């Protein structure tokens, strides 16, 4: 069902968003407590970027497959869902960038 595809996509994006939120919450504790050496700051920036790339890839995959799934179903409201999924992914990508911007500030 197109409505089920939409709901499941929104649920998956909420799950990824909560993963990014818990990641940032734990990162606030990790950066503030660590010995911020030149090697640590270089390594932690890479680790954060690697983690946020995985989250961004996961959200991109959800939006891409939902858009494809809906395009096939219309060959059997829909565009409203397409817009909300695109909107959620866009908002999630802005959130991911903002976590990376703040992490770079706590490390320096």
């Amino acid at each position, epitope marked *: 069902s197109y409505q089920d595809v939409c709901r499941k996509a929104k649920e998956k994006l909420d*799950k*990824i968003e*909560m993963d990014a939120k*818990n990641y940032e*919450t734990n990162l606030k504790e990790q950066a503030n407590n660590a010995d911020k050496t030149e090697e640590y700051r270089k390594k932690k920036k890479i*680790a954060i970027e690697a*983690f946020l790339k*995985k*989250i961004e890839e*996961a959200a991109d995959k959800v939006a891409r497959e939902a858009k494809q799934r809906l395009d096939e179903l219309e060959k059997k409201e829909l565009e409203k869902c397409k817009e909300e999924v695109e909107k959620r992914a866009r908002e999630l990508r802005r959130r991911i960038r903002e976590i990376l911007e703040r992490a770079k500030k706590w490390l320096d």
Partner: single-chain antibody, 228 residues
Framework: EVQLVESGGGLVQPGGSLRLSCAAS????????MSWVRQAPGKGLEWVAN????????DYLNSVRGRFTISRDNAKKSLYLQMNSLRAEDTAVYYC?????????????WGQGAMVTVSSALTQPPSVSEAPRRRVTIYCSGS????????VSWYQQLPGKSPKLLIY???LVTSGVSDRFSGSKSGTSASLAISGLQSEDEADYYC???????????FGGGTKLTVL
């Protein structure tokens, strides 16, 4: 301190019921997915269930559907597993686990396990070996519905200990885990490479991934690593 403590284990008759509980502390329990994973005596890991932050979604191992119920009470920071219609196949140590990142289906915190007595999709090599300071690789062969489309996790289990997450999202290393453990995924197979082998690396290693067809987490059969 991030901790998960299970209780409620015991001996039950076949057809009976038992309720396990898990007390969580050291983290915001209400913001995480939580899970149960079991291990029959002398056997490999087998995932049982997941539950979303507020109970909006539940995932189950097919063989426990209609018998088990996962639930949580965020005020009491507790995860539960109500087990009904018990069978001999359900005898196992049941581990309470945190599922984080939930989008990677990775069990990043494990409890010590509660023992319960009622009285294949992923292929791994049964054994791998090498001398200290050398390297080994452990394959994990799957299909398009699991490894092909979903993030792979790797776990290390030392004798008499709970499993520990090493790798998640196919190749991200858990914070605190040595960078000599590395993961990779190509097509429908995954690999864990361990270089700089130490005597403490002697353990069973398990891969896992979500499977779209089985609608659940699948684990490999495990690999016993021996250090010469």
């Amino acid at each position: 301190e991030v901790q998960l403590v299970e209780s409620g284990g015991g001996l039950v008759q076949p057809g009976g019921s038992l309720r396990l509980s898990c007390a969580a502390s050291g983290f915001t329990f209400n913001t995480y997915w939580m899970s149960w994973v079991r291990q029959a005596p002398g056997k490999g890991l087998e995932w049982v269930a997941n539950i979303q932050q507020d109970g909006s979604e539940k995932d189950y191992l097919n063989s426990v559907r209609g018998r088990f119920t996962i639930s949580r009470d965020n005020a009491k920071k507790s995860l539960y597993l109500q087990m009904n219609s018990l069978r001999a196949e359900d005898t196992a140590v049941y581990y309470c686990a945190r599922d984080n990142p939930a989008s990677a289906v990775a069990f990043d915190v494990w409890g010590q396990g509660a023992m319960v007595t009622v009285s294949s999709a992923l292929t791994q090599p049964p054994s791998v070996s090498e001398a200290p300071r050398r390297r080994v690789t452990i394959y994990c062969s799957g299909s398009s519905s699991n490894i092909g489309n979903n993030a792979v996790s790797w776990y290390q289990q030392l004798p008499g200990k709970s499993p520990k997450l090493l790798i998640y999202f196919d190749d991200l290393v858990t914070s605190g885990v040595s960078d000599r453990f590395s993961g990779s995924k190509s097509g429908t197979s995954a690999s864990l490479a361990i270089s700089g082998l130490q005597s403490e690396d002697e353990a069973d290693y398990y891969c896992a991934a979500w499977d779209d067809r089985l609608n659940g987490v699948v684990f490999g059969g495990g690999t016993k690593l021996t250090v010469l």
